[PDB]
Curated annotation (Swiss-Prot), chain A:
Glycans are attached at residue 34. It comes from the Viruses. Changing residue 13 to G: In strain: Omicron/BA.2, Omicron/BA.2.12.1, Omicron/BA.2.75, Omicron/BA.4, Omicron/BA.5, Omicron/BQ.1.1. The gene is S. Changing residue 22 to V: In strain: 20A.EU1. Attaches the virion to the cell membrane by interacting with host receptor, initiating the infection. The major receptor is host ACE2. When S2/S2' has been cleaved, binding to the receptor triggers direct fusion at the cell membrane. When S2/S2' has not been cleaved, binding to the receptor results in internalization of the virus by endocytosis using host TFRC and GRM2 and leading to fusion of the virion membrane with the host endosomal membrane. Alternatively, may use NRP1/NRP2 and integrin as entry receptors. This is Spike protein S1. Binds to host ACE2. RBD also interacts with the N-linked glycan on 'Asn-90' of ACE2. Cleavage of S generates a polybasic C-terminal sequence on S1 that binds to host Neuropilin-1 (NRP1) and Neuropilin-2 (NRP2) receptors. Interacts with host integrin alpha-5/beta-1 (ITGA5:ITGB1) and with ACE2 in complex with integrin alpha-5/beta-1 (ITGA5:ITGB1). May interact via cytoplasmic c-terminus with M protein. May interact (via N-terminus) with host bilirubin and biliverdin, thereby preventing antibody binding to the SARS-CoV-2 spike NTD via an allosteric mechanism.
Curated annotation (Swiss-Prot), chain B:
It comes from Severe acute respiratory syndrome coronavirus 2 (2019-nCoV). Attaches the virion to the cell membrane by interacting with host receptor, initiating the infection. The major receptor is host ACE2. When S2/S2' has been cleaved, binding to the receptor triggers direct fusion at the cell membrane. When S2/S2' has not been cleaved, binding to the receptor results in internalization of the virus by endocytosis using host TFRC and GRM2 and leading to fusion of the virion membrane with the host endosomal membrane. Alternatively, may use NRP1/NRP2 and integrin as entry receptors. Changing residue 6 to H: In strain: Omicron/BA.1, Omicron/BA.2, Omicron/BA.2.12.1, Omicron/BA.2.75, Omicron/BA.4, Omicron/BA.5, Omicron/BQ.1.1, Omicron/XBB.1.5, Omicron/EG.5.1. Changing residue 48 to K: In strain: Omicron/BA.1. Residues 20-42 are annotated as: Disordered. The chain holds residues 500 to 549 of 1273 of the full protein. This is Spike protein S1. It comes from the Viruses. The gene is S. Binds to host ACE2. RBD also interacts with the N-linked glycan on 'Asn-90' of ACE2. Cleavage of S generates a polybasic C-terminal sequence on S1 that binds to host Neuropilin-1 (NRP1) and Neuropilin-2 (NRP2) receptors. Interacts with host integrin alpha-5/beta-1 (ITGA5:ITGB1) and with ACE2 in complex with integrin alpha-5/beta-1 (ITGA5:ITGB1). May interact via cytoplasmic c-terminus with M protein. May interact (via N-terminus) with host bilirubin and biliverdin, thereby preventing antibody binding to the SARS-CoV-2 spike NTD via an allosteric mechanism.
Amino acid sequence: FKIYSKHTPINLVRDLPQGFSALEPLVDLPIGINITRFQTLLALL
Amino acid sequence: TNGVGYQPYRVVVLSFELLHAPATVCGPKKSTNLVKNKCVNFNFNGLTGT
């Protein structure tokens, strides 16, 4: 489950701007499991 | 007080199964020392050449 990742020093707050920047192979997960759906999970009136 | 026949053989039957959860209990390498400026053969992370 390859995790390509990168943080770029953007300076803005809203919709993704133009420009160019690559990502990097930050970590792989040498499992062989099956995955077909994901779900976001934040730091949960 | 019983016999060595009863004396337990500390037994580890190595139950291993193959071709699932890709091979993870594996075989290591044995290194050498680096050489330079010599037409030689080499092996690097599977990659081999001269």
